[PDB]
UniProtKB/Swiss-Prot annotation:
Keywords (A to Z) from UniProt: Isomerase, Magnesium, Metal-binding, Repeat
Top class in the EC scheme: isomerase
Cofactor(s) in the UniProt record: Mg(2+); Ni(2+); Co(2+)
Name by which UniProt lists this protein: Drimenyl diphosphate synthase
Organism, scientific name: Streptomyces showdoensis
Cofactor stoichiometry and binding remark: Requires a divalent metal cation for activity. The highest activity is observed in the presence of Mg(2+), but the enzyme can also use Ni(2+) and Co(2+) in vitro, while is inactive with Mn(2+) and Zn(2+). Binds a binuclear Mg(2+) cluster coordinated with Glu-117 and the diphosphate moiety of FPP.
Residues bound to Mg(2+) 2: E117
First and last residues of every PFTB repeat: 222-264, 272-314, 320-363, 373-414, 422-465
Functional description taken from the UniProt entry: Catalyzes the cyclization of farnesyl diphosphate (FPP) to drimenyl diphosphate. Cannot use geranylgeranyl diphosphate (GGPP) as substrate.
Presence of the UniProt keyword Metal-binding in the record: yes
Effect of Y453F: High decrease in catalytic activity
Active site: E251
Family matches, as InterPro entries: SQ_cyclase_C, Terpenoid_cyclase/PrenylTrfase
Length: 471
């Protein structure tokens, strides 16, 4: 057929091959400078795990020299080798690089993940400013999961590392420190670094399952993939980003729900209904959806994702319509929406356009939604790079993941024409395919925002999702 279909075919073979017999696509996270630096600081202060601290030191020096991250992580690394503003400043102050914020202690009180990180930073600031008496027993109590053996609580190495840097100041918690330092030291990757998270296999398996389910003839492996996801659902009916993550989130749950609706709607009928229930219980009064917890602010990409995921059930048409109306209201004067968990402009455009064009609509609302979708697709056309791709921002060089999101959106516009934006984007993706069938991309996932972390398995998965939508 076409060079695009040949590309799609080679990539689908690669993704299918990567799925294991347990139904999961492995999705390890690369080493990250922030967690590596905090681990070095911790092990160094405790005079522990000499072999690991030397590997961490060499990892940080190499990375700073060859592939330096953002300026904040660079400053963290240099400090150890030699609300977000509150958190990041307090991290640097704990490492001796700047002064502690002169804020009331209540400034630190607040994710269950963010809550633990901010309590740990509160303790570090109390001790660092010479006021250890300020720390209350409820502050220490929040940190107790960091003393449990095994992988980090919620697969979150930042939260455990900060908690342990705080807890090593408390005499009544130190008996438990030795054992957990051994398992922290045991997490180093082959390059000597500490990954941000244990992995992202639930998110990655769900997105890949969805992409495979959009192919003309989905592979047999979608069934064990669907099985592997459904048996990992949390009690509230939602999904976390990796095995062992108790805090469900809207983004993971929408990808799982979208996948199960296509590949296993009867086999996994109860998980499907529980995932819809999870989303509906989170819905905010304004018709939007938060990321984790009701009462926190609606977000555009989460609202669009939930609109599309719920649209399958005609019984939910009223909540879907209110979510799409929310998307229309929040479009910016230049046709864009607003980032978040992705650091590129194209992620929220792709979610918004799918919501604006999937939910069938007629009359005035059809015209309102069509105008919004056109402005967003026009923003993509206006910002497309000369090589046919998109970057993280309008003046950034193209990358396959940012381009994949734009392709998914453009596949909802008018048909590709020779030399048009969608045609040129697909040619860009065809040209970036590696001999082994895969894609390498700058990562787009952030957390804590805006700090990037790198799960390389996602590049293949999102490019396949784009090619499955566009063909
Ligand atoms: C599934 C995925 C694509 C959605 C992104 C959110 C997801 C559930 C994981 C984020 C990664 C996290 C473990 C690192 C800290 O992020 P953080 O949540 O603490 O970041 P924040 O402080 O800015 O809120
Ligand atoms: Mg956080
Ligand atoms: Mg975190």
């Amino acid at each position: 057929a076409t060079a695009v279909v040949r590309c799609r075919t080679r990539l689908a073979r690669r993704v299918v091959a990567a799925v294991g017999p347990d139904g999961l696509l492995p999705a390890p996270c690369e080493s990250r400078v922030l967690e590596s630096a905090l681990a070095l600081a911790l092990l160094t202060e405790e005079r522990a795990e000499a072999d690991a601290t030397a590997r961490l030191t060499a990892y940080l020096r190499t990375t700073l020299r060859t592939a330096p991250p953002d300026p904040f992580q660079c400053a963290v690394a240099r400090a150890v080798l030699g609300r977000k503003r509150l958190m990041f400043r307090t991290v640097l102050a704990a490492l001796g690089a700047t002064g502690f914020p002169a804020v009331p202690w209540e400034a630190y009180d607040t994710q269950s993940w963010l809550h633990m990180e901010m309590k740990a930073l509160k303790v570090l600031a109390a001790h660092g400013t010479g006021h250890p008496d300020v720390v209350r027993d409820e502050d220490w109590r929040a940190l107790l999961p960091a003393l449990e053996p095994g992988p980090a609580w919620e697969c979150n190495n930042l939260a455990q590392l900060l908690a342990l840097l705080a807890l090593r100041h408390s005499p009544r918690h130190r008996p438990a420190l030795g054992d957990v330092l051994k398992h922290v030291a045991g997490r180093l990757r082959p390059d000597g670094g500490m990954p941000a998270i244990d992995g992202m296999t639930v998110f990655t398996t769900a997105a890949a399952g969805l992409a495979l389910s959009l192919l003309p003839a989905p592979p047999a492996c979608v069934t064990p993939m669907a099985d592997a996801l459904a048996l990992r659902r949390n009690p509230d009916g939602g999904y976390g980003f990796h095995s062992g993550v108790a805090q469900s989130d809207v983004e993971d749950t929408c990808y799982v729900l979208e996948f199960l609706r296509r590949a296993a709607p009867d086999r996994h009928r109860t998980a499907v209904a529980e995932a819809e229930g999870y989303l509906l219980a989170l819905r905010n009064p304004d018709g939007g959806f938060p990321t984790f917890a009701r009462g926190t602010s609606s977000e555009i990409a989460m609202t669009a994702a939930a609109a599309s995921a719920l649209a399958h059930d005609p019984d939910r048409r009223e909540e879907v319509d209110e979510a799409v109306r929310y998307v229309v209201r929040h479009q910016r004067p230049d046709g864009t929406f607003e980032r978040s968990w992705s650091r590129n402009a194209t992620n929220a455009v792709f979610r918004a356009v799918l919501a604006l064009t999937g939910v069938a609509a007629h009359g005035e609302e059809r015209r309102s939604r069509a105008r919004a979708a056109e402005r967003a697709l026009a923003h993509l056309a206006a910002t497309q790079n000369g090589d046919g791709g998109w970057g993280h921002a309008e003046a950034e060089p193209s990358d396959p993941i940012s381009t994949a999101y734009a392709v998914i959106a453009l596949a909802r516009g008018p048909r590709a024409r020779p030399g048009g934006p969608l045609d040129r984007a697909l040619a860009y993706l065809v040209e970036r395919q590696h001999p082994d069938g895969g894609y390498r991309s700058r990562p787009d996932q952030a957390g804590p925002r805006p700090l990037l972390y790198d799960v390389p398995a996602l590049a293949d998965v999102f490019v396949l999702l784009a090619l499955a939508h566009a063909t």
